[PDB]
């Protein structure tokens, strides 16, 4: 049946962090061996199940919630981490059982004037339960109430952007991760 990964990896438009699209894939035959080829330096960090061992094994459902974050935060989306993405944007349950594909994508993610179509929520009152997604744009009173539906001393607007340009360091270079989080699907 040839499970569709041609979408989640090769789709033109690239999801941002907070709006991470958890594309559920199922009822089809996949091949994880297809993936080990692109990123000359992938990331495939398989938490839970061995990358090669995975092919002849399977579970009920799969979620490849791809998006884009800064290269220096590729290390950040790993279970048990406690960073900015981990606390407020995306997290992995401690008993994570998936594979975290992550590769450098300099092209199509770097305009000479900068691709600012990506944002990241740098502020939140409380941390995230595993796999929470929050599109809430409401203004973050990191500091006092008053009414807060617009302000600007500091209330703060919890969803900044990034800056992506080829001259940046590799850490600043944007990377697209594809976190897979796992009996109708296996090959």
């Amino acid at each position, epitope marked *: 049946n040839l499970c569709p990964f041609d979408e989640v990896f090769n789709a033109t438009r690239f999801a941002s962090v907070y709006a991470w699209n958890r594309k559920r894939i199922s009822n089809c035959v996949a091949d994880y061996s297809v993936l080990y080829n692109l990123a000359p330096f992938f990331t495939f960090k398989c938490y839970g199940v061995s990358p090669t061992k995975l092919n002849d094994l399977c579970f009920t459902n799969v979620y490849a919630d791809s998006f884009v974050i800064r290269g220096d935060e590729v290390r950040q989306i790993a279970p*048990g981490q406690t960073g900015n993405i981990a606390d407020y944007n995306y997290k992995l349950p401690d008993d994570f059982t998936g594979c975290v594909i992550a590769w450098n994508s300099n092209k199509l993610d770097s305009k000479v004037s900068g691709n600012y179509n990506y944002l990241y929520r740098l502020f939140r009152k409380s941390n995230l339960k595993p796999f929470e997604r929050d599109i809430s744009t409401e203004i973050y009173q990191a500091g006092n109430k008053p009414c807060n539906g617009v302000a600007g001393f500091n209330c703060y607007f919890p969803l900044r952007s990034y800056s992506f340009r080829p001259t940046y360091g590799v850490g600043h270079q944007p990377y697209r991760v594809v976190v897979l989080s796992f009996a109708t699907v296996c090959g």
Partner: antibody
Amino acid sequence: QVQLVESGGGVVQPGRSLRLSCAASGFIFSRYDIHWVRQTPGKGLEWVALIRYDGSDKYYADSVKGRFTISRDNSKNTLYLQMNSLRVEDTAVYYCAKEGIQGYSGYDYFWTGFYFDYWGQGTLVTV
Amino acid sequence: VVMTQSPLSLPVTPGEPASISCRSSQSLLQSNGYNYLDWYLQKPGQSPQLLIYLGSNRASGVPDRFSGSGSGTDFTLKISRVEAEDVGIYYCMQALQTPLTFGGGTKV
């Protein structure tokens, strides 16, 4: 709440062996590594050996590389290290140290390196 | 690899900042732009605790005054505000490959 408590060490005799066990809990002690590091007094800490979170594969220090034996013990969240054939210059407290990246089985570009986030309390062993 | 710290003793009267340096036999900065020395302290009569990791970004639960600078081979720990809680020997593990030649060790 990450906890590495260890016991088993003590006064021993040159030429024989001993069994060190570093019980763990608080975290899922089936996910990520534990290292061993020893410091003999009057000398800086010397790294001993590690093990990848299920016993996948082992490395030992160039000063040992084989007379030391480490063996994980899952299903009860305990670690076992077995020394063999101690020498004179091995009297040293042995620290079992948890390293704070929850181990992956793949190949990352970004490695984050070994770093022993939470440690034990040591077991003075003397030859 | 072998690590050599400096100074293995920096008795620093309280307040003013103290710097501790380590040398590397090879450039630890790997092609991904990460440095790998790790500063480990240990107060007298206690287990060592993580103080910095990967050279730059410290472990959660460590004050801001334990900033550590990075290079290709000459890394440095900055203790902006030294007081009683900061006393204890430090170390610089190189975290690049087995074996981890755990550094010499300074003093406070």
